[PDB]
Amino acid sequence: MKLSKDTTALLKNFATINSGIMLKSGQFIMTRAVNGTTYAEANISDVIDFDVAIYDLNGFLGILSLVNDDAEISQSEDGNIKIADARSTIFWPAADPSTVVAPNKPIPFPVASAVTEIKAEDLQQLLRVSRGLQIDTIAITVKEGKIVINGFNKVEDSALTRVKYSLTLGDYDGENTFNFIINMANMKMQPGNYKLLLWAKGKQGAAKFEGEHANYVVALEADSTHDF
Amino acid sequence: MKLSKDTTALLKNFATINSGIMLKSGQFIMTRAVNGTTYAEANISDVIDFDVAIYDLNGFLGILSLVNDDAEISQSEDGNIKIADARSTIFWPAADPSTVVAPNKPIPFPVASAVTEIKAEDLQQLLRVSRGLQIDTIAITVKEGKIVINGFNKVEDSALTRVKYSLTLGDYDGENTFNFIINMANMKMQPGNYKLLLWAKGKQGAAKFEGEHANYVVALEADSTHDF
Amino acid sequence: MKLSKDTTALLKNFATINSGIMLKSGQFIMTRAVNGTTYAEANISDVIDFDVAIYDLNGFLGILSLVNDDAEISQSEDGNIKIADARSTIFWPAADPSTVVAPNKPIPFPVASAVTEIKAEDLQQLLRVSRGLQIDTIAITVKEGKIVINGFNKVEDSALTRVKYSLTLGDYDGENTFNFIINMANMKMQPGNYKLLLWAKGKQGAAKFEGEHANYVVALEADSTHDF
Amino acid sequence: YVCVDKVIEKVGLDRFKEQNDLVEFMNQFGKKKMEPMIDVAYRELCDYMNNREHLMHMDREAISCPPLGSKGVGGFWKAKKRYALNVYDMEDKRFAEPHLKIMGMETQQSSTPKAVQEALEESIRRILQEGEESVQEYYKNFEKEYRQLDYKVIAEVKTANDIAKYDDKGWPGFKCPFHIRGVLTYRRAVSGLGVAPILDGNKVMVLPLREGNPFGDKCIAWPSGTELPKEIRSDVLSWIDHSTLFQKSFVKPLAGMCESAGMDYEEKASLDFLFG
Amino acid sequence: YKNFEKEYRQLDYKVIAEVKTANDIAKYDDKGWPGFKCPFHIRGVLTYRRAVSGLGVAPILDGNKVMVL
DNA sequence: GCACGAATTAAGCAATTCGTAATCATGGTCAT
DNA sequence: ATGACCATGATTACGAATTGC
């Protein structure tokens, strides 16, 4: 393996999403949450030649940080992971693929029922203020023709009616009024410019955040009221 | 109102004196400790539109610093505080006026018995040694003819027997001899030059640290002994 | 007495070795663990003018770091440590030599069964990878005419079979077959090109560690095997 | 006990000449004014239920009053049946000197040393008869003097049972008791030194230690009455000097009384006089 | 679950009130306030008793249909 | 309770509430 | 510049007390 620094940051994001990941061969990576409420993927620039399942990644990231970026990582002869630097040799245990939660095939995202462009600074400000305003969910919806995000604390309002923090995105050119809802605990994206893609048919629904680096998919909730 | 970064830093320093403060409309910002051991005053270019009883100054300033500098702060419809960025707004609750312990009247610190000057690095060194030497008590005294500083550890030596630390504040001109005893916990100065104005009467008295940004007023412990 | 940054940093390392220390007049400074597994010696850049016993070394390091280097360290009027610059003065008690443990004399370490050179970068890589991988045992041996170091955790691998690190020290010339076990709870050093001189006859031996300014000695575990 | 301070304020304190005048006034006030009222208001009871005859009596069993001119509190309550009074007249017997009368206070409990109880009773005498400066200065005087007594008398005693439940190589266990931690540290201190081992079921005297003691633990325990070995006798005396334990023994009850007495012992100086 | 949550607030508070027996109306509490460890129900018992001081309502008798909210 | 008496059954805990400690996430400030 | 270290809430667990079956 030849993992670049950007690839290391991407797998750090995946580690925040899920402790265990699998490196399928090629230049593509993907993962899902342990409870299966969040999916992620990335079209990395580094080649992968074989599949391997890893239980922990933060320690693996630290070990990769200790050695140079040009170290070669492959399957060890004893059924483990072997890392070879210019001088150092590192052995890492290998986990059974069935012991790691991961998806089967990459998610085909359906047609985006709604499209929005969330900027890096706005999304990052939302994440930082989440802890300050003790918010636990956010509703993306339509207000006076604008697509907006409003943060709601579920603990002190089970009906999600008390505004605490509101942020605007831009004009929405449509009459398909809706009031989505997203669990803040699933917002695990790297700070950057992302594309908000909303899909919702009847009960089923999802949202997708495509950055210049990777892509995330967050699951909507049954409390979301949508109509197109 | 409009709030600038220097004002936010002053507010953050004031937050250590007391958790909550009252921003009465005007130019003079000022607060006191919950136990009354110290009082702080400051004058800032920005004016305050109306009185608000902010409770969690740490949280309020934390969420405030995450938005643009020119964010506008005004009253919400429910009596809370609304801070609007160029593209978003946050609704921070304002508590009842009663629950915040605030100085009802600004203190007109009268003419002091003695005056002196202290440099910026002196306070830094004093605080660092108090953190290191576990210094509990500071004594402003006159030794050899020079006004000097002594450090004590009341926890063990309750009679201030061992002068753990000494510092020569500067020159003394006069015959009055005094030992001003002050606690470390109530020493919440910010780094910089300071002008000490000391006054004693009976069993009590005050010391005022005047600064180029903010000023502090501190009381004396019972062990302080004056001799005019 | 005067001290410099390098002297203070190595004194900090010595504090990591042992809490207390002995200061003989001159240049040559010794310390050893309470159980005596490891010893360390340094020749300071300055000159020591008095003999003193130190109990709380870390506080002394903090004090000497925060104060100006021009401050003079000497014996106080009560035979304690007095650190006084042109501005301040700090008094620290000197503990009774009976309570503290100091080496009797330096160990000359005349003979060296094995000689090897270890680079700073490789040492730091070993340290960090051992902290990450929870390695508390290093086995230094020679295989195929190559001096190598292997990581082992005797808690999980009492049979010394599972190898987690492979640190090839370099090339070996000779038919001596040695394998030395060292426990991580002892050695503590600053990153620098270093020399190692192992020696073990029968059941008694040690490993001397030569640095550009300071030296250490580590008692080899009795389970180490030697065929010289 | 009925508070009669309002009448004393109405007549005036300054018009008197000696404390005996105060007690004499409080004495004859009950007989001339209060006693006939008692008689009539109990005869109304006898009439209310038309009982047989009136037999109840009520006379001034005790008069409590602060010393004349002194700031002294002159008596205070703490809860149900825990008071303190500088009684001056009991059953029509004038006292030439103040007679202290307390109940339910923490001045007689066996767990505290005799010096502690004597100091508590002297603090009571002050807080009742003497002024605030008196109780203030006595607190610091007894703070200075309190460390200048023997270590064994000050230290308390506890019963240690089931040591093996709460030991792991001498370190504290799961909710390890104070005595257990102290005895484990003591056994680690003098292992193989020949003294009699400390086992379960034996009443063991215990005292804490300051932070950073060479024993590595904040406690010490050894058989009660017995004297610990001299080698560890020095440091354990030096490492407990001016300890905080008497906050758990004497300062806490003193606060509990003084707070209900409308006063504080250690002067909490502040800027309040500048604010007004 | 959703239907029950919908109809839980709108109904009368008595039919959801946790009605229990008042056993120790004075054993735990020191003076009105729940002094020592107080059972969930006794705290409410003393709360209502101190709320209706002079309100002209009969105070709690032990064993009554006191409901804790 | 005097003076016994002459026949005899409720067991052992499930559950809550609180306090105190033990461990664990998380932020403020500092040497770097 | 970056985590290190100390201090401060969450969370878990168990002793202790009491009443409920």
PDB file of N, CA, C and O in Angstrom, chain D residues 188-241:
ATOM      1  N   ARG D 188       2.972  -2.047  54.523  1.00  0.00           N
ATOM      2  CA  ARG D 188       3.981  -1.833  53.490  1.00  0.00           C
ATOM      3  C   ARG D 188       5.182  -1.065  54.028  1.00  0.00           C
ATOM      4  O   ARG D 188       6.298  -1.222  53.522  1.00  0.00           O
ATOM      5  N   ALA D 189       4.974  -0.226  55.044  1.00  0.00           N
ATOM      6  CA  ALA D 189       6.052   0.613  55.555  1.00  0.00           C
ATOM      7  C   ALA D 189       7.057  -0.180  56.382  1.00  0.00           C
ATOM      8  O   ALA D 189       8.267   0.043  56.268  1.00  0.00           O
ATOM      9  N   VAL D 190       6.583  -1.103  57.217  1.00  0.00           N
ATOM     10  CA  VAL D 190       7.444  -1.765  58.191  1.00  0.00           C
ATOM     11  C   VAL D 190       7.451  -3.271  57.972  1.00  0.00           C
ATOM     12  O   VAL D 190       7.556  -4.045  58.931  1.00  0.00           O
ATOM     13  N   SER D 191       7.335  -3.699  56.718  1.00  0.00           N
ATOM     14  CA  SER D 191       7.344  -5.124  56.412  1.00  0.00           C
ATOM     15  C   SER D 191       8.661  -5.756  56.850  1.00  0.00           C
ATOM     16  O   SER D 191       9.742  -5.310  56.455  1.00  0.00           O
ATOM     17  N   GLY D 192       8.564  -6.799  57.671  1.00  0.00           N
ATOM     18  CA  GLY D 192       9.735  -7.495  58.160  1.00  0.00           C
ATOM     19  C   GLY D 192      10.522  -6.774  59.229  1.00  0.00           C
ATOM     20  O   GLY D 192      11.682  -7.130  59.465  1.00  0.00           O
ATOM     21  N   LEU D 193       9.938  -5.775  59.885  1.00  0.00           N
ATOM     22  CA  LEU D 193      10.633  -5.020  60.920  1.00  0.00           C
ATOM     23  C   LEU D 193      10.385  -5.558  62.323  1.00  0.00           C
ATOM     24  O   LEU D 193      10.895  -4.981  63.289  1.00  0.00           O
ATOM     25  N   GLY D 194       9.616  -6.637  62.461  1.00  0.00           N
ATOM     26  CA  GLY D 194       9.486  -7.337  63.721  1.00  0.00           C
ATOM     27  C   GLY D 194       8.348  -6.894  64.615  1.00  0.00           C
ATOM     28  O   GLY D 194       8.091  -7.555  65.629  1.00  0.00           O
ATOM     29  N   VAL D 195       7.655  -5.803  64.285  1.00  0.00           N
ATOM     30  CA  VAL D 195       6.542  -5.373  65.123  1.00  0.00           C
ATOM     31  C   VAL D 195       5.356  -6.316  64.939  1.00  0.00           C
ATOM     32  O   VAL D 195       5.263  -7.070  63.963  1.00  0.00           O
ATOM     33  N   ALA D 196       4.443  -6.272  65.900  1.00  0.00           N
ATOM     34  CA  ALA D 196       3.285  -7.158  65.872  1.00  0.00           C
ATOM     35  C   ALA D 196       2.398  -6.823  64.679  1.00  0.00           C
ATOM     36  O   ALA D 196       2.046  -5.654  64.484  1.00  0.00           O
ATOM     37  N   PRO D 197       2.022  -7.805  63.863  1.00  0.00           N
ATOM     38  CA  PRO D 197       1.170  -7.514  62.706  1.00  0.00           C
ATOM     39  C   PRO D 197      -0.217  -7.066  63.132  1.00  0.00           C
ATOM     40  O   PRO D 197      -0.709  -7.412  64.209  1.00  0.00           O
ATOM     41  N   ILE D 198      -0.845  -6.276  62.268  1.00  0.00           N
ATOM     42  CA  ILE D 198      -2.186  -5.757  62.504  1.00  0.00           C
ATOM     43  C   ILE D 198      -3.164  -6.606  61.707  1.00  0.00           C
ATOM     44  O   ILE D 198      -3.104  -6.643  60.472  1.00  0.00           O
ATOM     45  N   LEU D 199      -4.062  -7.288  62.408  1.00  0.00           N
ATOM     46  CA  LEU D 199      -5.024  -8.198  61.802  1.00  0.00           C
ATOM     47  C   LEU D 199      -6.441  -7.682  62.030  1.00  0.00           C
ATOM     48  O   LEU D 199      -6.657  -6.643  62.659  1.00  0.00           O
ATOM     49  N   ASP D 200      -7.411  -8.426  61.506  1.00  0.00           N
ATOM     50  CA  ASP D 200      -8.808  -8.041  61.628  1.00  0.00           C
ATOM     51  C   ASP D 200      -9.301  -8.234  63.058  1.00  0.00           C
ATOM     52  O   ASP D 200      -8.793  -9.072  63.807  1.00  0.00           O
ATOM     53  N   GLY D 201     -10.302  -7.442  63.432  1.00  0.00           N
ATOM     54  CA  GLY D 201     -10.909  -7.548  64.739  1.00  0.00           C
ATOM     55  C   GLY D 201     -10.255  -6.734  65.836  1.00  0.00           C
ATOM     56  O   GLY D 201     -10.782  -6.705  66.956  1.00  0.00           O
ATOM     57  N   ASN D 202      -9.135  -6.076  65.561  1.00  0.00           N
ATOM     58  CA  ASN D 202      -8.418  -5.306  66.567  1.00  0.00           C
ATOM     59  C   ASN D 202      -8.660  -3.817  66.353  1.00  0.00           C
ATOM     60  O   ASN D 202      -8.567  -3.324  65.225  1.00  0.00           O
ATOM     61  N   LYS D 203      -8.970  -3.112  67.438  1.00  0.00           N
ATOM     62  CA  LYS D 203      -9.310  -1.700  67.356  1.00  0.00           C
ATOM     63  C   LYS D 203      -8.046  -0.893  67.074  1.00  0.00           C
ATOM     64  O   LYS D 203      -7.089  -0.936  67.850  1.00  0.00           O
ATOM     65  N   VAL D 204      -8.037  -0.156  65.961  1.00  0.00           N
ATOM     66  CA  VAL D 204      -6.818   0.417  65.404  1.00  0.00           C
ATOM     67  C   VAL D 204      -6.983   1.925  65.270  1.00  0.00           C
ATOM     68  O   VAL D 204      -8.004   2.401  64.763  1.00  0.00           O
ATOM     69  N   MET D 205      -5.986   2.676  65.738  1.00  0.00           N
ATOM     70  CA  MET D 205      -6.034   4.129  65.672  1.00  0.00           C
ATOM     71  C   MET D 205      -5.428   4.614  64.357  1.00  0.00           C
ATOM     72  O   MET D 205      -4.393   4.104  63.906  1.00  0.00           O
ATOM     73  N   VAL D 206      -6.083   5.609  63.753  1.00  0.00           N
ATOM     74  CA  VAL D 206      -5.894   5.984  62.358  1.00  0.00           C
ATOM     75  C   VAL D 206      -5.774   7.499  62.261  1.00  0.00           C
ATOM     76  O   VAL D 206      -6.507   8.229  62.936  1.00  0.00           O
ATOM     77  N   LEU D 207      -4.854   7.975  61.417  1.00  0.00           N
ATOM     78  CA  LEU D 207      -4.863   9.396  61.070  1.00  0.00           C
ATOM     79  C   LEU D 207      -4.385   9.583  59.637  1.00  0.00           C
ATOM     80  O   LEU D 207      -3.584   8.773  59.151  1.00  0.00           O
ATOM     81  N   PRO D 208      -4.839  10.622  58.943  1.00  0.00           N
ATOM     82  CA  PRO D 208      -4.441  10.833  57.551  1.00  0.00           C
ATOM     83  C   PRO D 208      -3.011  11.355  57.461  1.00  0.00           C
ATOM     84  O   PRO D 208      -2.313  11.499  58.460  1.00  0.00           O
ATOM     85  N   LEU D 209      -2.588  11.635  56.230  1.00  0.00           N
ATOM     86  CA  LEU D 209      -1.297  12.251  55.962  1.00  0.00           C
ATOM     87  C   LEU D 209      -1.471  13.301  54.873  1.00  0.00           C
ATOM     88  O   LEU D 209      -2.412  13.249  54.080  1.00  0.00           O
ATOM     89  N   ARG D 210      -0.548  14.257  54.837  1.00  0.00           N
ATOM     90  CA  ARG D 210      -0.611  15.301  53.826  1.00  0.00           C
ATOM     91  C   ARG D 210      -0.269  14.738  52.451  1.00  0.00           C
ATOM     92  O   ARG D 210       0.271  13.638  52.315  1.00  0.00           O
ATOM     93  N   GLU D 211      -0.601  15.511  51.420  1.00  0.00           N
ATOM     94  CA  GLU D 211      -0.279  15.112  50.058  1.00  0.00           C
ATOM     95  C   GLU D 211       1.229  15.114  49.847  1.00  0.00           C
ATOM     96  O   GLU D 211       1.932  16.030  50.281  1.00  0.00           O
ATOM     97  N   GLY D 212       1.724  14.085  49.166  1.00  0.00           N
ATOM     98  CA  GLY D 212       3.141  13.980  48.891  1.00  0.00           C
ATOM     99  C   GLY D 212       3.962  13.312  49.965  1.00  0.00           C
ATOM    100  O   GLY D 212       5.188  13.468  49.971  1.00  0.00           O
ATOM    101  N   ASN D 213       3.333  12.581  50.880  1.00  0.00           N
ATOM    102  CA  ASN D 213       4.077  11.886  51.914  1.00  0.00           C
ATOM    103  C   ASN D 213       4.917  10.766  51.300  1.00  0.00           C
ATOM    104  O   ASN D 213       4.552  10.204  50.264  1.00  0.00           O
ATOM    105  N   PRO D 214       6.052  10.428  51.917  1.00  0.00           N
ATOM    106  CA  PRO D 214       6.905   9.370  51.352  1.00  0.00           C
ATOM    107  C   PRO D 214       6.253   8.001  51.341  1.00  0.00           C
ATOM    108  O   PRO D 214       6.677   7.137  50.563  1.00  0.00           O
ATOM    109  N   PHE D 215       5.241   7.769  52.178  1.00  0.00           N
ATOM    110  CA  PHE D 215       4.565   6.479  52.191  1.00  0.00           C
ATOM    111  C   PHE D 215       3.700   6.267  50.956  1.00  0.00           C
ATOM    112  O   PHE D 215       3.271   5.137  50.702  1.00  0.00           O
ATOM    113  N   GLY D 216       3.431   7.322  50.193  1.00  0.00           N
ATOM    114  CA  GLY D 216       2.650   7.218  48.981  1.00  0.00           C
ATOM    115  C   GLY D 216       1.154   7.185  49.187  1.00  0.00           C
ATOM    116  O   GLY D 216       0.412   7.132  48.200  1.00  0.00           O
ATOM    117  N   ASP D 217       0.688   7.221  50.432  1.00  0.00           N
ATOM    118  CA  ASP D 217      -0.732   7.160  50.735  1.00  0.00           C
ATOM    119  C   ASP D 217      -1.059   8.203  51.789  1.00  0.00           C
ATOM    120  O   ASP D 217      -0.199   8.607  52.575  1.00  0.00           O
ATOM    121  N   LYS D 218      -2.324   8.625  51.812  1.00  0.00           N
ATOM    122  CA  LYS D 218      -2.771   9.712  52.673  1.00  0.00           C
ATOM    123  C   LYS D 218      -3.351   9.217  53.990  1.00  0.00           C
ATOM    124  O   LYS D 218      -4.271   9.841  54.529  1.00  0.00           O
ATOM    125  N   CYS D 219      -2.843   8.106  54.518  1.00  0.00           N
ATOM    126  CA  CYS D 219      -3.411   7.502  55.712  1.00  0.00           C
ATOM    127  C   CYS D 219      -2.336   6.717  56.448  1.00  0.00           C
ATOM    128  O   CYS D 219      -1.308   6.346  55.875  1.00  0.00           O
ATOM    129  N   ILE D 220      -2.589   6.466  57.731  1.00  0.00           N
ATOM    130  CA  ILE D 220      -1.731   5.610  58.539  1.00  0.00           C
ATOM    131  C   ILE D 220      -2.577   5.030  59.664  1.00  0.00           C
ATOM    132  O   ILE D 220      -3.497   5.679  60.172  1.00  0.00           O
ATOM    133  N   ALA D 221      -2.268   3.787  60.039  1.00  0.00           N
ATOM    134  CA  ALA D 221      -3.065   3.038  61.001  1.00  0.00           C
ATOM    135  C   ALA D 221      -2.169   2.104  61.799  1.00  0.00           C
ATOM    136  O   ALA D 221      -1.311   1.430  61.228  1.00  0.00           O
ATOM    137  N   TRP D 222      -2.385   2.049  63.109  1.00  0.00           N
ATOM    138  CA  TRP D 222      -1.637   1.124  63.951  1.00  0.00           C
ATOM    139  C   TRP D 222      -2.442   0.846  65.210  1.00  0.00           C
ATOM    140  O   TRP D 222      -3.324   1.634  65.568  1.00  0.00           O
ATOM    141  N   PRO D 223      -2.163  -0.260  65.908  1.00  0.00           N
ATOM    142  CA  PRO D 223      -3.001  -0.638  67.054  1.00  0.00           C
ATOM    143  C   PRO D 223      -3.120   0.474  68.087  1.00  0.00           C
ATOM    144  O   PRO D 223      -2.152   1.172  68.398  1.00  0.00           O
ATOM    145  N   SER D 224      -4.334   0.630  68.608  1.00  0.00           N
ATOM    146  CA  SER D 224      -4.664   1.757  69.469  1.00  0.00           C
ATOM    147  C   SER D 224      -3.926   1.674  70.797  1.00  0.00           C
ATOM    148  O   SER D 224      -3.727   0.589  71.351  1.00  0.00           O
ATOM    149  N   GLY D 225      -3.521   2.835  71.307  1.00  0.00           N
ATOM    150  CA  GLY D 225      -2.760   2.904  72.538  1.00  0.00           C
ATOM    151  C   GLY D 225      -1.292   2.612  72.315  1.00  0.00           C
ATOM    152  O   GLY D 225      -0.418   3.250  72.909  1.00  0.00           O
ATOM    153  N   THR D 226      -1.018   1.641  71.451  1.00  0.00           N
ATOM    154  CA  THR D 226       0.347   1.264  71.135  1.00  0.00           C
ATOM    155  C   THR D 226       1.050   2.398  70.399  1.00  0.00           C
ATOM    156  O   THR D 226       0.421   3.268  69.791  1.00  0.00           O
ATOM    157  N   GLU D 227       2.377   2.383  70.465  1.00  0.00           N
ATOM    158  CA  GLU D 227       3.204   3.406  69.845  1.00  0.00           C
ATOM    159  C   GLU D 227       3.949   2.806  68.663  1.00  0.00           C
ATOM    160  O   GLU D 227       4.572   1.747  68.787  1.00  0.00           O
ATOM    161  N   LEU D 228       3.875   3.484  67.522  1.00  0.00           N
ATOM    162  CA  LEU D 228       4.508   3.014  66.306  1.00  0.00           C
ATOM    163  C   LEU D 228       6.028   3.144  66.409  1.00  0.00           C
ATOM    164  O   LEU D 228       6.540   3.899  67.237  1.00  0.00           O
ATOM    165  N   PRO D 229       6.770   2.398  65.586  1.00  0.00           N
ATOM    166  CA  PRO D 229       8.234   2.410  65.697  1.00  0.00           C
ATOM    167  C   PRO D 229       8.818   3.797  65.490  1.00  0.00           C
ATOM    168  O   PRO D 229       8.279   4.626  64.754  1.00  0.00           O
ATOM    169  N   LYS D 230       9.946   4.039  66.162  1.00  0.00           N
ATOM    170  CA  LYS D 230      10.550   5.367  66.169  1.00  0.00           C
ATOM    171  C   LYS D 230      11.065   5.774  64.796  1.00  0.00           C
ATOM    172  O   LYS D 230      11.072   6.967  64.473  1.00  0.00           O
ATOM    173  N   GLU D 231      11.493   4.809  63.977  1.00  0.00           N
ATOM    174  CA  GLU D 231      12.086   5.144  62.684  1.00  0.00           C
ATOM    175  C   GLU D 231      11.100   5.897  61.799  1.00  0.00           C
ATOM    176  O   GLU D 231      11.472   6.864  61.126  1.00  0.00           O
ATOM    177  N   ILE D 232       9.837   5.473  61.792  1.00  0.00           N
ATOM    178  CA  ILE D 232       8.789   6.165  61.056  1.00  0.00           C
ATOM    179  C   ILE D 232       8.036   7.151  61.940  1.00  0.00           C
ATOM    180  O   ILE D 232       7.019   7.707  61.516  1.00  0.00           O
ATOM    181  N   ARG D 233       8.507   7.374  63.167  1.00  0.00           N
ATOM    182  CA  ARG D 233       7.826   8.297  64.068  1.00  0.00           C
ATOM    183  C   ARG D 233       8.070   9.747  63.676  1.00  0.00           C
ATOM    184  O   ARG D 233       7.167  10.584  63.790  1.00  0.00           O
ATOM    185  N   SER D 234       9.276  10.064  63.209  1.00  0.00           N
ATOM    186  CA  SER D 234       9.615  11.450  62.905  1.00  0.00           C
ATOM    187  C   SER D 234       8.791  11.976  61.738  1.00  0.00           C
ATOM    188  O   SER D 234       8.029  12.940  61.883  1.00  0.00           O
ATOM    189  N   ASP D 235       8.916  11.339  60.572  1.00  0.00           N
ATOM    190  CA  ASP D 235       8.283  11.869  59.368  1.00  0.00           C
ATOM    191  C   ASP D 235       6.769  11.932  59.516  1.00  0.00           C
ATOM    192  O   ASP D 235       6.140  12.912  59.099  1.00  0.00           O
ATOM    193  N   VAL D 236       6.164  10.903  60.117  1.00  0.00           N
ATOM    194  CA  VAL D 236       4.714  10.904  60.283  1.00  0.00           C
ATOM    195  C   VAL D 236       4.277  12.070  61.157  1.00  0.00           C
ATOM    196  O   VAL D 236       3.160  12.581  61.013  1.00  0.00           O
ATOM    197  N   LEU D 237       5.143  12.519  62.068  1.00  0.00           N
ATOM    198  CA  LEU D 237       4.833  13.725  62.822  1.00  0.00           C
ATOM    199  C   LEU D 237       5.040  14.971  61.972  1.00  0.00           C
ATOM    200  O   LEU D 237       4.256  15.922  62.055  1.00  0.00           O
ATOM    201  N   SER D 238       6.086  14.978  61.144  1.00  0.00           N
ATOM    202  CA  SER D 238       6.369  16.148  60.326  1.00  0.00           C
ATOM    203  C   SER D 238       5.416  16.254  59.144  1.00  0.00           C
ATOM    204  O   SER D 238       5.106  17.365  58.697  1.00  0.00           O
ATOM    205  N   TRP D 239       4.938  15.126  58.629  1.00  0.00           N
ATOM    206  CA  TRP D 239       4.084  15.131  57.452  1.00  0.00           C
ATOM    207  C   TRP D 239       2.606  15.269  57.793  1.00  0.00           C
ATOM    208  O   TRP D 239       1.766  15.142  56.898  1.00  0.00           O
ATOM    209  N   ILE D 240       2.272  15.507  59.060  1.00  0.00           N
ATOM    210  CA  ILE D 240       0.903  15.782  59.478  1.00  0.00           C
ATOM    211  C   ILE D 240       0.773  17.123  60.186  1.00  0.00           C
ATOM    212  O   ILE D 240      -0.311  17.454  60.677  1.00  0.00           O
ATOM    213  N   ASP D 241       1.844  17.913  60.233  1.00  0.00           N
ATOM    214  CA  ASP D 241       1.808  19.216  60.886  1.00  0.00           C
ATOM    215  C   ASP D 241       0.780  20.127  60.224  1.00  0.00           C
ATOM    216  O   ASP D 241       0.729  20.237  58.996  1.00  0.00           O
TER     217      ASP D 241
END
